[PDB]
Amino acid sequence: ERVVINVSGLRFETQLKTLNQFPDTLLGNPQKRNRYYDPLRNEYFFDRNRPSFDAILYFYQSGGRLRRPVNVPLDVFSEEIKFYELG
Amino acid sequence: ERVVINVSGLRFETQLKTLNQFPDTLLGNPQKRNRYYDPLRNEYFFDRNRPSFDAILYFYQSGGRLRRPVNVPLDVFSEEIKFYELG
Amino acid sequence: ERVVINVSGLRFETQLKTLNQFPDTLLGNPQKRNRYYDPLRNEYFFDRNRPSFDAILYFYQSGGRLRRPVNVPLDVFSEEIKFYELG
Amino acid sequence: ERVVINVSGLRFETQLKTLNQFPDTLLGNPQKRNRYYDPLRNEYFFDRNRPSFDAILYFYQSGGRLRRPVNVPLDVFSEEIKFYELG
Known part of the structure; x- marks a missing residue:
């Protein structure tokens, strides 16, 4: 589960x-x-930006809310959104 | 303990x-x-926002002081405060 | 070591x-x-603020440089400095 | 790998x-x-600043993009860039 x-x-x-x-x-x-x-290891592995993932996971947990972490630059974060296919 | x-x-x-x-x-x-x-696993598990928890735990450790982490948006943080029943 | x-x-x-x-x-x-x-467990345990510790440890690693983490409020951080006796 | x-x-x-x-x-x-x-332990160990490393690792992962974490002071971060030889 x-x-x-x-x-x-x-x-x-x-x-x-x-x-x-x-x-x-x-x-x-x-x-x-x-x-x-x-x-x-029974886990999914991503060799990607760590700080951006908190907001990515929260998107699912909040039922669709996406907020950019201030500590993460806008262009770095947008690349992550594109990779995880949230848009 | x-x-x-x-x-x-x-x-x-x-x-x-x-x-x-x-x-x-x-x-x-x-x-x-x-x-x-x-x-x-002998632990309490919450499938919730990670960044907000530092301020939640500190509330107990400081004996009642609640400060919002700048890196956490105001609306995300307020939902957490409501969930943990600190208000 | x-x-x-x-x-x-x-x-x-x-x-x-x-x-x-x-x-x-x-x-x-x-x-x-x-x-x-x-x-x-062979470790030192502190039931204290987590975000502030990065700057505390860096104080030793940098040979004496103390910088306040922006994400940590000034009054929370000052209490930590007092506890660890860096002043 | x-x-x-x-x-x-x-x-x-x-x-x-x-x-x-x-x-x-x-x-x-x-x-x-x-x-x-x-x-x-089969790992590389660095007794250095933790917050700065997210941006250092991302430099490699992004293929050359270097962005300073807002939460990390400019003078602390520049010392790290010099140490890891990214410039």
Whole structure:
């Protein structure tokens, strides 16, 4: 019931139900997310920006609210939104 | 004597005495906090905003001081305060 | 040669030599730091503000430079400086 | 294929291929990075500023983009850039 997402060493844990809410996104779509799955460690690994992920995960947890972390530059954050397919 | 609170993968450790200071809150009230207790991992798990929790825990540690993290948006933070019942 | 400081669940690792640089401080003075030592886990535990500690540790690592983290309020940070005896 | 960089207790994980992109830097040059390698723990250890490292790692991940974290002071960050040899 609980998924582990490893973003460059920073582990995030959430419920599969939280991700499946938006099946139109990378993390909400099994076919897409599975290419990042590590069966040895049983977690999804992304070699990407760590600070931006708090806002990405919150998008799912809040049911669709997206807020840019002030500490994260606008151009860095927009690239992440595009990668995770939230737009 | 020490409690572990797991907020979306981010572990916080504090003393039970620190939480019991405010028995009128979610974390200070055994009946409320226990529904989030995971006996397998022996920790309380919250699938919620990670950045906001530093200020939530500090509220207990400082004996009642609540300060909003600049890096956390006002509307996101207020929802957390309501959830943890600090108001 | 390496010490582990656990601040409310957030682990920091540094070298004993880095702390001993300022023997006039809490962390640089064996008699003071030892009352926070946990022999079971072999780490020093502080049930205190997590965000402020990055600047506290950097004080030792930089050889005396103290900068307040913008994300940490001035009154919260000053209380930490007083506790760790850096002034 | 995956490297672990331990910055004062904060673990970062990336791919060796991500670092080797810039062989002219500390982390991209085997001869330089190896003096910080810990064979016992199998990770590279740096007793340095933690907040600055997110932007340092992102430099490699983004293929050369360097942005200063607002929460990190300009003079602290510049010292890190010099140490990791990104300039």
